[PDB]
Structure 1
Amino acid sequence: RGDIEKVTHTGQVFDKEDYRNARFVNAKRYVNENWGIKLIEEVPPKECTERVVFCDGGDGPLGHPKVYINLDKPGNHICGYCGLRFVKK
């Protein structure tokens, strides 16, 4: 079926000759469709004015630890935890 040849977001797939596909003849291979690498890429960056800002995952105690980011460089800056991007202009 389709799922056998589908390649997961981690980049793994059994070769069409690999015997290990035998395990899927009577079952399915759920490949998640909501790839995190693309959903985070979709969200646009946040323009700021201050020189340093903080992201906490967005919901305080339900988010990730509060980390501060420095925006001096031109390129928009990624948060280590949540992956959100920040930029000063």
Structure 2
Amino acid sequence: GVRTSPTGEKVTHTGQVYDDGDYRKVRFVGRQKEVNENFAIDLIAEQPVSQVGSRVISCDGGGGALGHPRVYINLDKETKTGTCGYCGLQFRQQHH
């Protein structure tokens, strides 16, 4: 989420913030700094891991033609989960 710097300026989801002595901060006097409050890295971490019963699962992002190119994910490793390279959803094999 958004956390403020010691000088009171908010930090963007990319990590950007002007240091205390940076002259470029003058552009925000009598104005505001546009920051999006919905951090995508936090939002996708709330999604539950989907349990499946196959070695290989497919993801298209949902919506069919409205999602992303369909990719197949391998779930042979139990140390970690299978992550979709497009939408960030996670999949796991059920106890095998």
Percent pairwise identity = 57
Aligned residue for 2:45, secondary structure, equals: helix
Q: TM-score, normalised by structure 2?
A: 0.86
Q: How far apart, CA to CA, are the structure 2 residues paired with 1:37 and 1:10?
A: 10
Kindly report the root-mean-square deviation, in angstroms, between the aligned alpha carbons of the 2 structures: 1.5
Of the candidates 77, 82, 89, which is equivalent to residue 77 of structure 1?
82
Q: Which residue of 2 is the match for residue 42 of structure 1?
A: 46
Q: Which runs of 5+ in 1 are unaligned?
A: none
Instruction: Tell me the amino acid that sits aligned with residue 57 of structure 1.
Output: G
Q: TM-score, normalised by structure 1?
A: 0.92
Q: Judging by fraction of residues, say which structure has more helix.
A: 1
4+ residue runs of structure 1 moved beyond 4 angstroms?
none
Q: How far apart, CA to CA, are the structure 1 residues paired with 2:23 and 2:30?
A: 14
Residues 5 and 16 in structure 1, CA contact (< 8 A), matched pair in contact too: no
Residues 53 and 68 in structure 1, CA contact (< 8 A), matched pair in contact too: yes
Aligned residue for 1:41, secondary structure, equals: coil
Shift of 1:70: 0.7
Aligned residue for 1:38, secondary structure, equals: helix
Q: Which runs of 5+ in 2 are unaligned?
A: none
Q: How far apart, CA to CA, are the structure 2 residues paired with 1:54 and 1:26?
A: 51
